[PDB]
């Protein structure tokens, strides 16, 4: 209805005659596909100096809260997340540590040949190792593949 010009006769030239007005997208130049199904992809860029693992965890939690209030027929999936490769690799080292400790215990139980004897060193292993974690928190040193 906006009137660009008022003619000599009392007729108002309006946008509707010259153009067609509708509510669309500001840009039509990019789309997103997830598994062929159309989808809107949101890319998260880490703030410089921020831990990747912590950030990803926070995003996933906020996604779950949002999902509860999602309109029917809307679902969220996090297809690509670098963190996953880190979590798994870190976990693998943790598994190695448990396995290593168990194997060491067996070698010790062979050499000591007495049940209790083997325990004495056993108890020492986690006290020392866990004290190390406390120290690296004081230093501010972070858990990483190399520390683990």
């Amino acid at each position: 209805n906006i009137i660009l010009r008022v003619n000599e006769d009392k007729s108002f030239l309006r946008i509707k005659d010259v153009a067609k007005v509708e509510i669309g997208a500001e840009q039509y130049n990019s789309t997103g596909r997830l598994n062929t199904s159309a989808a809107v992809p949101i890319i998260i860029n880490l703030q410089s100096g921020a831990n990747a693992v912590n950030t990803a965890k926070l995003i996933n939690e906020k996604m779950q809260e949002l999902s509860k209030n999602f309109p029917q027929g809307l679902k969220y999936q996090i297809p690509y997340d670098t963190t996953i490769f880190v979590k798994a690799s870190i976990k693998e080292v943790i598994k190695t540590f448990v396995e290593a400790l168990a194997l060491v215990l067996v070698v010790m139980y062979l050499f000591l040949k007495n049940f209790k004897s083997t325990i004495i060193p056993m108890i020492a292993v986690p006290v020392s190792l866990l004290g190390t974690f406390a120290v690296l928190y004081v230093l501010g040193f972070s858990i990483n593949l190399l520390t683990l």
Binding site: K20, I23, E26, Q27, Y28, N29, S30, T31, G32, R33, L34, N35, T36, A39, P41, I43, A52, Q77, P79, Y80, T82, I84, F85, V86, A88, S89, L146
Partner: protein, 396 residues
């Protein structure tokens, strides 16, 4: 001791071994001028083939979005293929890549690079030196393209550089507007008004916000796609002069087809091109870094300046200390020992023990074929401490 030295000569030098990330990132770039519709058809086809593959769990595609530039190009498109769990899949990530490459890259004839995912462009990866050739002189990007293609050929002939590539492209098709200023003035038309008309029709113009959903959303004015669909579109557009007469845009303005670069890249305030290189298996990344430098120096020396980014800058400017550190560590050990022993002569016995463990490690490593990665370098240090204990206890 001679064996240890020899093994160090042969053992390849590397930073961190590659582990299958579990996700392959494929960059698909259709021809330079290709429009978005062609780009999407291309990716849907890849996606359909991808779901057929039992190996790939899911696929996310960002169409029209180039990863490296982080800019929207109609021709570019990036698809991430999320592979299955390491246990769930019998194929390594690289084996999966081969099947995919054979299936469509040869056939679809659409540029596609299958790369791994790097958390950090340089730290995560190894050797992917991405040096910039920043021109000092002011020359046409076309000339730069030529010049940087010569250096690319020389890089190919260099003995140990791999997959050397330049991201610069000066092929994209662009219409060059020729502005007849005299004609325009004859028609009594301001130049700002002219372009405001063209920005309004061929382009998108943001006038003001409108209120929807308790938010402000822009109001954009653009011509119907059909009018701006082809060239000569100027003939249809009309701009009123100071006089009531409407003047066709075509009269004062001419569009001629030219080739230019869509992405103008500048590094350190100088127009620049991105030469991306990888070290051939025969050479260490460093050697590769200095090899490319001499290729650039030989063919781009007069006007272009070599510059380095990422890991490469860190390596070149590292001037790292601590070479003496290792010797110092041993000297420290020598002294703390000669105070425990109270005899200057005996710590020598424990230090002599240390090469034996080093020998065993740099032996197994050169046997398997493992390079001297940080892992080996570090692991070394624990073997040196453990050997010490065996030695100190016995000598005491």
């Amino acid at each position: 001791i001679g064996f240890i030295a020899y093994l160090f000569k042969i053992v390849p030098s590397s930073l961190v071994p590659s582990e299958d990330q579990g996700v392959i990132m494929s960059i698909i770039n259709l021809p330079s001028g290709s429009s978005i519709h062609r780009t999407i058809e291309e990716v849907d086809t890849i996606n359909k083939n991808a779901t057929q593959m039992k190996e790939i769990s899911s696929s996310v595609s960002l169409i029209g979005f180039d990863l490296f530039t982080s800019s929207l190009k109609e021709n570019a498109a990036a698809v991430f293929f999320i592979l299955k769990d390491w246990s769930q899949r019998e194929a390594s990530s690289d084996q999966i890549i081969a099947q995919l490459f054979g299936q469509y890259a040869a056939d679809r004839n659409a540029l596609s690079y299958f790369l791994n995912l790097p958390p950090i462009p340089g730290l995560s990866l190894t050797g992917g030196f991405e040096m910039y050739a920043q021109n000092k002189s002011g020359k046409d990007y076309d000339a730069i393209q030529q010049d940087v293609n010569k250096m690319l050929e020389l890089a190919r002939t260099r003995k140990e550089l791999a997959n050397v590539r330049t991201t610069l492209d000066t092929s994209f098709p662009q219409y060059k507007l020729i502005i007849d200023r005299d004609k325009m003035k004859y028609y009594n038309l301001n130049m700002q008004d002219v372009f405001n008309t063209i920005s309004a029709t061929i382009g998108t113009y943001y006038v003001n916000d409108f209120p929807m959903l308790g938010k402000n959303f822009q109001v954009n004015i653009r011509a119907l796609g059909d009018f701006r669909n082809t060239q000569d579109a100027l003939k249809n557009i009309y701009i009123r002069s100071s006089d009531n007469k409407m003047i066709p845009l075509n009269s004062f303005l001419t569009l001629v087809r030219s080739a230019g670069p869509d992405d103008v890249k500048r590094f350190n305030l100088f127009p620049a091109a991105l030469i991306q290189g990888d070290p051939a298996p025969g050479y260490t990344s460093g050697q590769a870094i200095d090899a490319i430098a001499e290729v650039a120096k030989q063919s781009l020396g007069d006007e272009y300046s070599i510059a380095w980014s990422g890991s490469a800058y860190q390596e070149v400017s590292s001037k790292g200390a601590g070479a003496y550190a290792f010797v110092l560590g041993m000297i420290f050990v020598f002294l703390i020992l000669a105070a425990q022993y109270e005899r200057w002569l005996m710590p020598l016995a424990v230090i002599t023990a240390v090469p034996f463990a080093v020998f065993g490690s740099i032996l197994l490593v050169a046997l398997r074929g493992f390079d001297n990665d940080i892992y080996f370098q570090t692991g070394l240090l624990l073997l040196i401490g453990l050997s010490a204990k065996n030695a100190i206890l016995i000598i005491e």
